[PDB]
């Protein structure tokens, strides 16, 4: 049952997050204060549901939605806690993941208690394909690009005849990032996070993965790398920031 | 809209082929037919949808009556709303059709149902062991394995299972994989998805001797196992716990999604 949500001094006992390889979630990973997370690693790996304690630090492993995990599978795993009085994050977040909406319904069905800690508008432009390849060709940013996108290509081979198109970094005029519809979307931000430079891209996995602009906007936030997201129209722009900016 | 389910009475498909020929196939981003969707098919030139492939979640393809549209994949985190978007996409008529993304952590049939009643198109839906049912333990299974020199699907991520293997089967070097010493074990994680376990398990088309797969390891409960254990091909010996489990697990089996 969530108690209260955060909008720390004083109660104890916090409720981490992570996968089966034992690594913690993004949201319970800034929880920490300089703690030693070493016991973590000690009994790894671990099975769904698994609960381990040191001190008021408490950690459970959680099923992943993104390789297929229900609601019912994380309120069965939130069950295998200990009751008491948590302060934690909504647990498997973001991009492909269960929503703010599952997480919280999650927590409120569990037996304890918890204190509920939450997870650019600039950014957000409304250009087309040559708009956008001009921006990046004399920025030098990258450019994430779906290669199974044959109108996208055939622009592409045409400004930059000559092109070897191959998957991943592709520098030939613009720095072009290209990903398949294969790659799955949380794979594909994973990738740019790690890389961590400017981008100029489409809400990534729109259309192409199956995603509406809603669906595509919310894994966009586990974007990390600075990027200048474009949008078809300039109506679409409001709503795309309406998307972001409010609950999963 | 689902018009109607072949149940042999009072709907067959020889009597739904008055109200329509067309036929609604589902496939993958590389453009391979689904499981249910592909014993649809009678001898059919299937060249046309790997003509145009790699394909993108909800693009449909026409080739005289047989139409086929890319669904998204639950197991690779697709939603139900994304398979009705996908659906949405078919243009609007009567269809014989499957229930589509069947099955291992894919949608549920009640999902499925759904999906197909939300759209604007008529559907007349198709439907998609008993015998192997067992109720052994370890030591039991592991004496069936060595005799009968059948595959053993374990977990390593048990560490009591993985203490009585080596201390029966001493010397051996547990790893990833076939590992053939005494008894033929198929070592498997708890970070290896339940879908891509029943996949290479099927391609290996052993006889095998297992318990369901992904019971408690992966954070199943027995009915959710029992979904997944559909899709086993390979014939099995399926252990579980007590006798009483036996009827249970063979209840969720047979029953729907």
New interface residues.
Partial sequence: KIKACIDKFLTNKLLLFAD??GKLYHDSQNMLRGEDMSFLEKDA?????DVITSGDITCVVI?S??????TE?LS??LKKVPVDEYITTYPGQGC?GYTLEEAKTALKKCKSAFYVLPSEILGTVSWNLREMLAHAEETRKLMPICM??RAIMATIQRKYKGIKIQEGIVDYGVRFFFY???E???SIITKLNSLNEPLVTMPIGY??????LE?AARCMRSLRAPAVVSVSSPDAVTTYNGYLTSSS
């Fill in positions: 089966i390889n790996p671990y099975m769904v549901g099923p939605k993104k390789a297929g995990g229900t599978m069965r795993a492909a199974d996108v398949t519809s294969k799955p979307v949380a259309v192409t993965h199956g995603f509406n669906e």
